[PDB]
Scaffold this active site. Structure first.
Site, PDB file in Angstrom:
ATOM      1  N   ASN A   1     -13.745  55.110 -21.516  1.00  0.00           N
ATOM      2  CA  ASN A   1     -14.611  54.065 -20.999  1.00  0.00           C
ATOM      3  C   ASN A   1     -15.762  54.704 -20.216  1.00  0.00           C
ATOM      4  O   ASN A   1     -15.805  55.917 -20.009  1.00  0.00           O
ATOM      5  CB  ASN A   1     -13.781  53.114 -20.122  1.00  0.00           C
TER       6      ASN A   1
ATOM      7  N   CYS B   1     -23.333  49.973 -21.923  1.00  0.00           N
ATOM      8  CA  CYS B   1     -22.113  50.526 -22.521  1.00  0.00           C
ATOM      9  C   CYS B   1     -22.367  51.134 -23.901  1.00  0.00           C
ATOM     10  O   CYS B   1     -21.776  52.165 -24.260  1.00  0.00           O
ATOM     11  CB  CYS B   1     -21.058  49.415 -22.593  1.00  0.00           C
TER      12      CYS B   1
ATOM     13  N   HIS C   1     -18.261  45.081 -25.620  1.00  0.00           N
ATOM     14  CA  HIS C   1     -18.223  46.323 -24.863  1.00  0.00           C
ATOM     15  C   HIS C   1     -18.109  47.490 -25.832  1.00  0.00           C
ATOM     16  O   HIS C   1     -17.247  47.481 -26.718  1.00  0.00           O
ATOM     17  CB  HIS C   1     -17.045  46.287 -23.878  1.00  0.00           C
TER      18      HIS C   1
ATOM     19  N   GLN D   1     -21.562  53.741 -16.092  1.00  0.00           N
ATOM     20  CA  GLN D   1     -22.758  52.979 -16.425  1.00  0.00           C
ATOM     21  C   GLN D   1     -23.255  52.136 -15.265  1.00  0.00           C
ATOM     22  O   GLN D   1     -24.346  51.566 -15.358  1.00  0.00           O
ATOM     23  CB  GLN D   1     -22.497  52.063 -17.620  1.00  0.00           C
TER      24      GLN D   1
HETATM   25  C1  LIG Z   1     -22.240  46.896 -22.501  1.00  0.00           C
HETATM   26  O1  LIG Z   1     -22.469  47.386 -21.405  1.00  0.00           O
HETATM   27  N1  LIG Z   1     -22.624  45.652 -22.851  1.00  0.00           N
HETATM   28  N2  LIG Z   1     -22.316  45.180 -24.119  1.00  0.00           N
HETATM   29  C2  LIG Z   1     -23.173  45.395 -25.148  1.00  0.00           C
HETATM   30  O2  LIG Z   1     -24.204  46.034 -25.031  1.00  0.00           O
HETATM   31  C3  LIG Z   1     -22.759  44.800 -26.488  1.00  0.00           C
HETATM   32  C4  LIG Z   1     -21.726  45.715 -27.171  1.00  0.00           C
HETATM   33  C5  LIG Z   1     -21.296  45.227 -28.512  1.00  0.00           C
HETATM   34  C6  LIG Z   1     -20.740  44.012 -28.820  1.00  0.00           C
HETATM   35  N3  LIG Z   1     -20.484  43.925 -30.160  1.00  0.00           N
HETATM   36  C7  LIG Z   1     -20.874  45.098 -30.763  1.00  0.00           C
HETATM   37  C8  LIG Z   1     -20.825  45.485 -32.094  1.00  0.00           C
HETATM   38  C9  LIG Z   1     -21.292  46.749 -32.424  1.00  0.00           C
HETATM   39  C10 LIG Z   1     -21.788  47.602 -31.444  1.00  0.00           C
HETATM   40  C11 LIG Z   1     -21.836  47.207 -30.118  1.00  0.00           C
HETATM   41  C12 LIG Z   1     -21.380  45.936 -29.761  1.00  0.00           C
HETATM   42  N4  LIG Z   1     -23.938  44.660 -27.305  1.00  0.00           N
HETATM   43  C13 LIG Z   1     -24.665  43.531 -27.304  1.00  0.00           C
HETATM   44  O3  LIG Z   1     -24.390  42.535 -26.671  1.00  0.00           O
HETATM   45  O4  LIG Z   1     -25.720  43.673 -28.143  1.00  0.00           O
HETATM   46  C14 LIG Z   1     -26.823  42.675 -28.174  1.00  0.00           C
HETATM   47  C15 LIG Z   1     -26.279  41.442 -28.858  1.00  0.00           C
HETATM   48  C16 LIG Z   1     -27.899  43.332 -29.006  1.00  0.00           C
HETATM   49  C17 LIG Z   1     -27.332  42.364 -26.786  1.00  0.00           C
END
Ligand SMILES: *C(=O)NNC(=O)[C@H](Cc1c[nH]c2ccccc12)NC(=O)OC(C)(C)C
Length: 220
Positions: free
Chosen positions: A187, A25, A163, A19
């Site tokens: 990953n 992610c 993540h 990524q």
């Molecule tokens: C990855 O490169 N960065 N992280 C994310 O995008 C978060 C991943 C994440 C965290 N908790 C989750 C629950 C279900 C699915 C994915 C999840 N996503 C994230 O921060 O989403 C926002 C809050 C919408 C920005």
């Protein structure tokens, strides 16, 4: 359920991707799960476009390189009526305007399924469905430096994940502490991270790093 599962040996899993520095992610986890379910359906493994999701699934709730959710990605593929191949819509690691072309769509889904928040239910889904999208607490230096073995981080949170990754199986190996079970996790940080881009994450240790707290897969 089986004691060990590895969907890579069944042809369900594309090679490890990278990524970059974009917070995408969630798109890699979603394409991984959809690659598996499309293979289950058609017998053809086709790498899917994470950039398609990053650029285009904002209306479903995603935020491009600032983050997203796998379920929002699955909803986009359903709403949009398709998703382009990786080859047709390659990954640029930056958010740009949507360039989806239906002529190059190679995947579809009709929704998604959220797994109950227990490792026993995650195990049943992994054993019977294929690779499963999950979210984990990866915010620790021990995760950056992982080389081999079963990853266990005492400071890991079961509720605050950051993540998105992909469970492609599970298994066991003898350890000093006799905490021997692991989830086999793909990953999206390239091949040089971990074990060829994979990590064995502690399994049946009270939902370590929250791996069973946001598990889901697309319906194809
Ligand atoms: C990855 O490169 N960065 N992280 C994310 O995008 C978060 C991943 C994440 C965290 N908790 C989750 C629950 C279900 C699915 C994915 C999840 N996503 C994230 O921060 O989403 C926002 C809050 C919408 C920005």
């Amino acid at each position: 359920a089986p004691r060990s599962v590895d969907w890579r040996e069944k042809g369900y899993v594309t090679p490890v991707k990278n990524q970059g520095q974009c917070g995408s992610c969630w798109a890699f986890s979603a394409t991984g799960a959809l690659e598996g379910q499309m293979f289950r359906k058609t017998g053809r493994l086709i790498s899917l476009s994470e950039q398609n999701l990053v650029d285009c699934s904002g209306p479903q709730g995603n935020e491009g390189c600032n983050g997203g959710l796998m379920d929002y990605a699955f909803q986009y593929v359903q709403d949009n009526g398709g998703l382009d191949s990786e080859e047709s819509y390659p990954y640029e690691a930056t958010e740009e305007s949507c360039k989806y072309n239906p002529k190059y769509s190679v995947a579809n889904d009709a929704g998604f399924v959220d797994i109950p928040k227990q490792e026993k239910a995650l195990m049943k889904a992994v054993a019977t469905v294929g690779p499963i999208s999950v979210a984990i607490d990866a915010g620790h230096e021990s995760f950056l430096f992982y080389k081999e073995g079963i990853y266990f981080e005492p400071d890991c949170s079961s509720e605050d994940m950051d993540h998105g990754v992909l469970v492609v199986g599970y298994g066991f190996e003898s350890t000093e502490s006799d905490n021997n079970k692991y989830w086999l996790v793909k990953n999206s940080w390239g091949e040089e991270w971990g074990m060829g881009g994979y990590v064995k994450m502690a399994k049946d240790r009270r939902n370590h790093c929250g791996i069973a707290s946001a598990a889901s897969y697309p319906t194809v």
